[PDB]
Amino acid sequence: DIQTERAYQKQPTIFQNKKRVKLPRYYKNIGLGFKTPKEAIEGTYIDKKCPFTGNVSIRGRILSGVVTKMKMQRTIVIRRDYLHYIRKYNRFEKRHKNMSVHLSPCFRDVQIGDIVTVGECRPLSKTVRFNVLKVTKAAGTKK
Amino acid sequence: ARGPKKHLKRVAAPKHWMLDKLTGVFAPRPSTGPHKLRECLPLIIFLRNRLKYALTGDEVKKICMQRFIKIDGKVRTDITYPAGFMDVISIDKTGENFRLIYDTKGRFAVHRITPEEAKYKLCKVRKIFVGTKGIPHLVTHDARTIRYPDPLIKVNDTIQIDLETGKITDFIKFDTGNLCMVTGGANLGRIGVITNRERHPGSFDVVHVKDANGNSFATRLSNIFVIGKGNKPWISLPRGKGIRLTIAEERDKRLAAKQSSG
């Protein structure tokens, strides 16, 4: 149930037409003390915009946020919340800068209001320069 | 910008050059070479300003045509040649071989050495590039392409080479407790052993360098240059010895020297 587009979608590393008589999944590590989920190994999904099963480099700044929108496909919109101290009036002001982050299809069961880790990468599109590393669930919601 | 720079300003200069404001407006631009721009110091400035032999710029041009100054195994007659870290400037007529070592402050220190000490110098490698048929090529700190190395020469391990032939003699292995000249940033020109190693993924590793006078300081992985195996230096050291004493103790020793002199 893959390749709904017109062209042929595949991974450029694997080869499936050698002289024989299930295809093995190709993946690589991201580093920086992280692991891979079991569904990413067991699945058969293909996406070139993926740190493990694809070609993109995660480097630079590592930030965090929260997921608030899942309307657009293969991407999510996050929103940062932080404060700042003013030296003239010794009080705090509110700041927020939203941005769009590409969403890897291995993260299947993801709901809104969960903490997401974003990582800086090369620009794949106009306003997306970040990928998803890990998603942690909020308070409760065991079901 | 549409092109590179031709001139150089006197104000746009680091602190350790000790170039005053009143004498000149346009600074002597160093030519391109193995060393960087801010790390090196020009030969014409090293002649007329620091050692104070010549005064004008035409006299340095009249000197360099007769081929007196030899730079680290080559008779170089370029007045704007980049001479940087661990270079040997040899002069045959006067017989005063100099060695460029940082002082305990941010400045350098003028130090005369024997010709037996000037026959060798200490260098640092950066990486090992794989050739077209698996031939390892060393990359030094100032681009000396020497191929077919020894396998024990790692990235952090330093080598002791010869000037005229370009061959290694000894090697200092990066181990704990070795003397290291920290060259970079605020902690510039510091001597101390490595008492602790702390790893960090992503960024460079910080090293707590400790001097044996009750002083310790943390410095990143880029400012590491070991000189000897633990407590065995093979180089001669100038005055100051990398103590990092306080400014009150410096004022007290200056007052003691003034009272001793009169």
Binding site: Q3, E5, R6, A7, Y8, K10, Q16, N17, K18, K19 | -
Partner: protein, 206 residues
Amino acid sequence: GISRDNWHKRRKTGGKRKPYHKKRKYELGRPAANTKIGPRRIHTVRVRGGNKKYRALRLDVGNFSWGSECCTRKTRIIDVVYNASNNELVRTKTLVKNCIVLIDSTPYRQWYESHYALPLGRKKGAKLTPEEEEILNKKRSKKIQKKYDERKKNAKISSLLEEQFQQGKLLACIASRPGQCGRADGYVLEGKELEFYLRKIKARKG
């Protein structure tokens, strides 16, 4: 002309990106190559950085890798078959990257009939009349005939490729860009890829 820039359009919010400078020479975009099939003619273009770029115009030959034994040969390109996105390039035979072409079967047929010494293609009814490879097939030694038999055993090909060698028109794809480097390199479609493209051909035809 036209260039690659981000300031010409609006923002993500909706504001107007107003410039602060005029033209730049590095901001420049050349038109497409749009190569064809015909006699050999390649133009050159000097680009930024003192480099050259070979723009193809017409080319009737190509190098296509047969992925099983990993051996490629120069092969004549005769026809453009089908493109995925733009269906007008099926009618107007303009070659770009990732296009399906018909290529000749005779160099790989000669390589198979010379190395493996087995009849490739050869629809039943027409025998080998010049009698050139029939000498190379027979007249072998007894100790080397076992090596020929061991080479003959591991030479199984599928029927979907056997029909294509019977018609004498193989399918091939485009891997290297003809406008960037100049060489029109590619590979031969095998297995599920060949079934997918032939299913697209059948869905386009009837």
